[PDB]
């Protein structure tokens, strides 16, 4: 019924070859060549551990979330968001939590600028964690699934989990499937209470309808979601557009 549901049905009809040509058509991406080569060699300075550092940097450099004080990073994985925040002037502590174990990335130890204010803790399912006081709440959880009802369930669970962590603080939260009417209802209620806006990051793949609820902005959630569904549906029409290439983020070295 929603434009997003039509997008997901069409995405599920693609062959692997078609899917591989669609997923990056017209997106933006950072060139990870140098970082991957450095990481393979065990280099611990300058490189971002994942594409996530540039993905969060995109929101921060637009002032959509402005990390400060004690940052919590839920679903930190290898730690791209955490290591990026560790170098920001207003940040004083970064605590990352992630599941780890089979099927999940482990935190990567690094020596990028501000490493000494970061603690990444694996073996932590955030759905069992009691909330902690923080000045910035980040969450990048939401596992894609071919089933949109599984994605709807996973999105609602994240939105219910994150709310007790929100106390008039800065935030950036992934919304895996933002187009279902039940999710829209939660998002509108959450925006009435905590403010912010839902934003599509250009570095996201066309194979996910993810959007991020960020704290600094206003706007109409329904309009923003439908614009993304129409964008993703239009990207099935034409031949692959190679992604727009950008430089990856240099996270430096040193303590603070
Ligand atoms: N065409 C289109 C298609 C889709 Cl499916 C979704 C969105 C758009 N359009 C844009 O995204 N337009 C836009 C224009 C100039 C700069 C940027 S920006 O993201 O670089 N910086 C911002 C953005 C918003 C605010 C705000 O509202 O406070 C603050 C800073 C975005
Ligand atoms: C891949 S990370 C996102 C990228 C990350 N922001 C970065 O920059 O590296 C998302 C993570 O959420 C983790 N995750 C999934 N379910 C989780 C849960 N219940 N509790 C904690 N972490 C979870 C996954 O293991 C995955 O590593």
Swiss-Prot record:
Residues where Phosphoserine is found: 50
| Localization, UniProt | Host endoplasmic reticulum membrane; Host nucleus
According to the lineage, what is the superkingdom? Viruses
- mRNA cap 0-1 NS5-type MT domain boundaries: 1-250
Annotated residues that bind S-adenosyl-L-methionine are located at 50, 80-81, 98-99, 125-126, 141, 212
Q: What is the effect of changing residue 142 to A?
A: 70% loss of N7 methylase activity; 60% loss of 2'-O methylase activity
Q: Residues at site: Essential for 2'-O-methyltransferase activity?
A: 55, 174, 210
Q: List the membrane topology term(s).
A: Peripheral membrane protein
Reactions catalysed according to its record: a 5'-end (5'-triphosphoguanosine)-ribonucleoside in mRNA + S-adenosyl-L-methionine = a 5'-end (N(7)-methyl 5'-triphosphoguanosine)-ribonucleoside in mRNA + S-adenosyl-L-homocysteine; a 5'-end (N(7)-methyl 5'-triphosphoguanosine)-ribonucleoside in mRNA + S-adenosyl-L-methionine = a 5'-end (N(7)-methyl 5'-triphosphoguanosine)-(2'-O-methyl-ribonucleoside) in mRNA + S-adenosyl-L-homocysteine + H(+)
What residues correspond to the site Essential for 2'-O-methyltransferase and N-7 methyltransferase activity?
140
* Result, substituting residue 157 to A: 40% loss of N7 methylase activity; No effect on loss of 2'-O methylase activity
- Residue positions of motif SUMO-interacting motif: 71-74
Site keyed mRNA cap binding: positions:
8, 11-12, 14, 19, 23, 144, 205, 207
Q: What post-translational changes are documented for it?
A: Sumoylation of RNA-directed RNA polymerase NS5 increases NS5 protein stability allowing proper viral RNA replication. Phosphorylated on serines residues. This phosphorylation may trigger NS5 nuclear localization.
UniProt-reported outcome of changing residue 154 to A: 40% loss of N7 methylase activity; No effect on loss of 2'-O methylase activity
**Per the record, what is the consequence of mutating residue 176 to A?**
No effect on N7 methylase activity; 80% loss of 2'-O methylase activity
Which residue positions are annotated as catalytic?
Answer: 55 (for 2'-o-mtase activity), 140 (for 2'-o-mtase activity), 174 (for 2'-o-mtase activity), 210 (for 2'-o-mtase activity)
This protein's assembly is summarised as:
Homodimer. Interacts with host STAT2; this interaction inhibits the phosphorylation of the latter, and, when all viral proteins are present (polyprotein), targets STAT2 for degradation. Interacts with serine protease NS3.
Q: What does this protein do?
A: Replicates the viral (+) and (-) RNA genome, and performs the capping of genomes in the cytoplasm. Besides its role in RNA genome replication, also prevents the establishment of cellular antiviral state by blocking the interferon-alpha/beta (IFN-alpha/beta) signaling pathway. Inhibits host TYK2 and STAT2 phosphorylation, thereby preventing activation of JAK-STAT signaling pathway.
Q: This chain belongs to which protein, by name?
A: RNA-directed RNA polymerase NS5
Biological source species: Dengue virus type 3 (strain Philippines/H87/1956)
The range of the complete sequence contained here reads 2497 to 2746 of 3390
């Amino acid at each position: 019924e929603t434009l997003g549901e039509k997008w997901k049905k069409k995405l599920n009809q693609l062959s692997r070859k078609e899917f591989d040509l669609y997923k990056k058509s017209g997106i933006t991406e950072v060139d990870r060549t140098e970082a991957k080569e450095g990481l393979k060699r065990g280099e611990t300075t300058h490189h971002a551990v994942s594409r996530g550092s540039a993905k969060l940097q995109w929101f921060v450099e637009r002032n959509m979330v402005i990390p400060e004080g004690r940052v919590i990073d839920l679903g930190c994985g290898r730690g791209g968001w955490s290591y990026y925040c560790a170098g920001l002037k207003k940040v004083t502590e970064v605590r990352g939590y992630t599941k780890g174990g089979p099927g999940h990335e482990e935190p990567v130890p690094m020596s990028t600028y501000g490493w000494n204010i970061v603690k990444l803790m694996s073996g932590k399912d955030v759905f069992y964690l009691p909330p902690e006081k923080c000045d910035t709440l980040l969450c990048d959880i939401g596992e894609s699934s071919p089933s949109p009802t599984v994605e709807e369930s996973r999105t609602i669970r994240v939105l219910k989990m994150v709310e007790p962590w929100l106390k008039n603080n800065q935030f950036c939260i992934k919304v895996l499937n933002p187009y279902m009417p039940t999710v829209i209802e939660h998002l509108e209620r959450l925006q009435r209470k905590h403010g912010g806006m839902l934003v599509r990051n250009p570095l996201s793949r066309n194979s996910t309808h993810e959007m991020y609820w960020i704290s600094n902005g206003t706007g109409n959630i329904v309009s923003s979601v439908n614009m993304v569904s129409r964008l993703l549906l239009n990207r099935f029409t034409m031949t692959h557009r190679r992604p727009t290439i950008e430089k990856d983020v240099d996270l430096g070295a040193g303590t603070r």
